[PDB]
Amino acid sequence: VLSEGEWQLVLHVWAKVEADVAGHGQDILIRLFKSHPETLEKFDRFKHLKTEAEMKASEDLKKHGVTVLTALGAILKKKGHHEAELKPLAQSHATKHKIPIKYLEFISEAIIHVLHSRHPGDFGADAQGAMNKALELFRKDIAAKYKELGYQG
Ligand code: HEM
Known part of the structure; x- marks a missing residue:
């Protein structure tokens, strides 16, 4: 569960995107x-x-x-x-596109690197940690749906 302060850091950089x-x-x-x-x-x-x-x-x-x-x-x-x-x-990424959870970890790493390159003043370590938490929550919740459907592996 992200705190409100962590969400503000996430959405502040996201507004720059x-x-x-x-x-x-x-x-x-x-x-x-x-x-x-x-x-x-x-x-x-x-x-x-x-x-x-x-x-x-x-x-x-x-x-x-x-x-x-x-x-x-x-x-x-x-x-x-x-x-x-x-x-x-x-549902589409598990059953149609066949994307492993691990590749969602990889795109999360790429998102974080690109935000750091493009928005360093709004993406210091506090905001990097918050965005990491947000992307982990995304992956956690997608993984629970994959597991339901028989794709967690
Ligand atoms: C932040 C993570 C991601 C988001 C928000 C995202 C979002 C989407 C959306 C909105 C679509 C079109 C609607 C649908 O098919 O569900 C799509 C299509 C697709 N995605 Fe993702 N995706 C993500 C990650 C990935 C990754 C990591 C891969 C592959 C390594 C992937 C592979 C695909 C494929 C193959 C399609 C169909 C493309 C086509 O042939 O039109 N996605 N994605």
Whole structure:
């Protein structure tokens, strides 16, 4: 359970993201695919991209980054009261997209790195710890749905 002060730190940096959702979404997906190439393999849509320059040039990748970050932003702004938003995401990522919980840990690491790069003055250690807590809560709650459905592994 995050405290109110931890949520304020999370949402204060998140407000900075929403000024350039698409640029953040590109940096986060590119970092994810570079750091953990097994993740790229889950996207039939993107698995033709073989270089970072090709990734940065893909408008479809940029569109998907906005889809991802729009869904995460709506979850974060519920401050933990996010059951309605996670249900459908857990269900599609477990049963259709086949995304292991561990890859949600990987995209969480990429989100944190990109926020630190783009927003250092609003992403000191207190805010990094709070965002880590928020992303852990996201993963915890998605993992409980995966386990229900027979996908926690
Ligand atoms: C913060 C974490 C994430 C969020 C909020 C998120 C959100 C979404 C949303 C909103 C969609 C479209 C609606 C749906 O299918 O449910 C989607 C699609 C998808 N996601 Fe995620 N996602 C996340 C992490 C990941 C990760 C880590 C992977 C793979 C390693 C992944 C793989 C996919 C795939 C394969 C699709 C379908 C893309 C397509 O072919 O159109 N997602 N995601």
